[PDB]
Design a protein around this ligand. Sequence first.
Ligand SMILES: [Mg+2]
Lengths: 180, 133
Amino acid sequence: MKLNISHPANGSQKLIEVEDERKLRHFYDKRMGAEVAGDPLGPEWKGYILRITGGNDKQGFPMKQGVIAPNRVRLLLSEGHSCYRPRRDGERKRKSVRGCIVGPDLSVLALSIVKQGEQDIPGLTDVVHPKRLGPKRATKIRRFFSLSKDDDVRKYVIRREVQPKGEGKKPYTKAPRIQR
Amino acid sequence: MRTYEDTFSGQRIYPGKGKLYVRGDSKIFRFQNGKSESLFLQRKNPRRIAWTVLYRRQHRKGISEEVAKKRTRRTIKSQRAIVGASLEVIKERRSMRPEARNAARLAAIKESKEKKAAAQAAKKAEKAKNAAA
RNA sequence: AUUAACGAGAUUCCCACUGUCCCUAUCUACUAUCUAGCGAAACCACAGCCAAGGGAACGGGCUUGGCAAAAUCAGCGGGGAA
RNA sequence: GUUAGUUUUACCCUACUGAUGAACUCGUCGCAAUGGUAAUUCAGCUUAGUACGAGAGGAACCGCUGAUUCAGAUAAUUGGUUUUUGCGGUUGUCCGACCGGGCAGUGCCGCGAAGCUACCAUCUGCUGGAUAAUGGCUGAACGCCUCUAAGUCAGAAUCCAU
RNA sequence: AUGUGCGAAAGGGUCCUGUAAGCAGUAGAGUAGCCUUGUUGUUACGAUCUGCUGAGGGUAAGCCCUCCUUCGCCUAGAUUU
RNA sequence: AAACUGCGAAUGGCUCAUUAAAUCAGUUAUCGUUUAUUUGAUAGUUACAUGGAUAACCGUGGUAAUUCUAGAGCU
RNA sequence: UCAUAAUAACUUCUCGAAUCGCACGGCCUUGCGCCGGCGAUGGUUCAUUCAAAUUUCUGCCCUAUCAACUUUCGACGGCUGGGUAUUGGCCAGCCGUGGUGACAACGGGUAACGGAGGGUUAGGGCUCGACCCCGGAGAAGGAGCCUGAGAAACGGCUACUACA
Ligand SMILES: [Mg+2]
């Protein structure tokens, strides 16, 4: 079985191999969106609480919030559902989905950290990843940089740095196109 | 080993007891004992049978409730570093209070006023030459 | 020679049904059973363990062998060419 | 050629299946003469696409797992049986009505423990000796040969024991 | 034949059936009365439903436990060696 | 470039199976109804500007199998 | 009982521009002031256009070895409602007993989509019309539906049947 662990605080992701069925007997009744103590995983994981986000079956099928069953069921999907993207306005396709009860059948599980412990994870909490793009709507800059109603918000626009590939010409800057 | 729950009456079932009945349309039923099985085959309704687990739950006899919604609703976290600049650089963009920011504003508006006056002066010069033309 | 209706008349097939059967199991009442009281009949040369032999050519009895231990109760249907 | 037509008696003697029993004081624990005897056949995997054969075709011992017929037990689970007349429903009539009851040889229906019971359910069914047919060893009679004439080896679902 | 005794009741356990009698109701399809005429106006009748109620009844006659629940019985009579 | 949003995809093209007052033809009615689009008119009873998501995107996956898709971070 | 207007009210209740491109103008308290043009995209109602859906009158080939048909479970009509974009036996309740027919109803056959029209000729006719234009229906057979002004759509989806 495979586990895909993600850390939203620092924004990092890793996957770990676990082969001991005895270690994972502690779930197998937990639902989607619940709390659990990750301490019995091991000593370096003491003082951790995990949130169950979802997984993939052995065939590749995902699970869907709101269907209470350990098996998989066919349903009549519509617009707005989680595991279907229609190709034309108004389509409704019948598909098969996995229930919201964890079991020994799943092929890959996935979890997120809610509260850390004292030990550190050798590949997860030691590196931190930044965000990708700053704000661009007018109200966002004022609240973000705490300016008042009349503080010339336009000037404070976070900009990126880009280098032209032409004869190593001196780079220039790129900006977010303030709206409203 | 494993255990099952009676379909008709909800009683618990250990290995070896009871039987398993498969209906014509590929639906599997389990009965803990003869009493459940016999009643089911007569098209009786479980809702109206006084000793069933479903009947008790439907009439709400002897059970209470629980909730923890507002506990998991307090999960809020902190901000993270942008790629625009160094995280410490990001903060100091609004670390300072309103003195130095205000001082720049007077210079900026004076620059704006100077350009507008130059435009008006240039326009008057442009108007004069146009008439002279 | 045909023939509608009729038949506790003889014969063949089909649907429903079932312990007729595969293959047997269980329950109830009245006897059989034991006791107190009453209390017969058919039948009977003498009687009553077998194998072989010869003989009126299929013996309980004869010849040669096998064997063989008091008094008795409930069933059974081989024989007594019952 | 066709249709319809009464099938009597066992309690006696013996034979057989079982169950008591007088004599040497009453008991407990044992030996074993004699009598009886029991297991049977098939299928699948591997050996094997092999030995053999030009080709087409196409085996066997050991090993593993099951099954058919028969025999001896047992009832945790499944099913059958209901006078447990246990609980409930219900028809007719009778006790003035309700409650509680009688009768309809067990009124009828639903469920029904205990006991009995079903390859309709579950468990179990051993190895020593001597031999026949046949194949052999040493070896004369008959200077050679020969499994037999003296001696001797292996050996069957057979025979006798466990 | 003084006992971890025997017997008769009782309590608890385990099982079978499936929610007792009685009381109450802002339940109940409506009909007939009486009025100060009502947001349920009351008085009479009314299969059934809801609550007290997984309650009531039965339970060894070839079920289990009780020194720690109660009440009783007891070192015989006759025959024989 | 990619992607969100808007529109069309209900037009064209093919065939003659069914259908005997049914389809169809000429001629009437909507004072008995709907109509994107086109054209023409037409609406006095914090305001220097309001709020949360999501795509594209970086990076971690499953199945032999598809114009299948999961969970994490931005707008 | 039209157009339009007035009165009393009501509404999980709408609409009356938090939208985009070009130009760069005019005033006097000289303020980061006020006013100003041409377009695009939208918006309530009315009118028009492309239409659509129903609908009045008359007109079809063979057959009597098809003469009486329709109403159980609407068949002809009246009333009160429901539903549809709207009328209507279209549907739900109550009530009358009607409707078609020898001037050929009802039923059966068609190697039958209808029409504008093709072939052959004194005149009158006989026969063909799947097929380039107009109208109708269908996407293997039946049914059911989402989006939209417009679909009972099939180079859209759901289920069964038969193939694969
Ligand atoms: Mg070969």
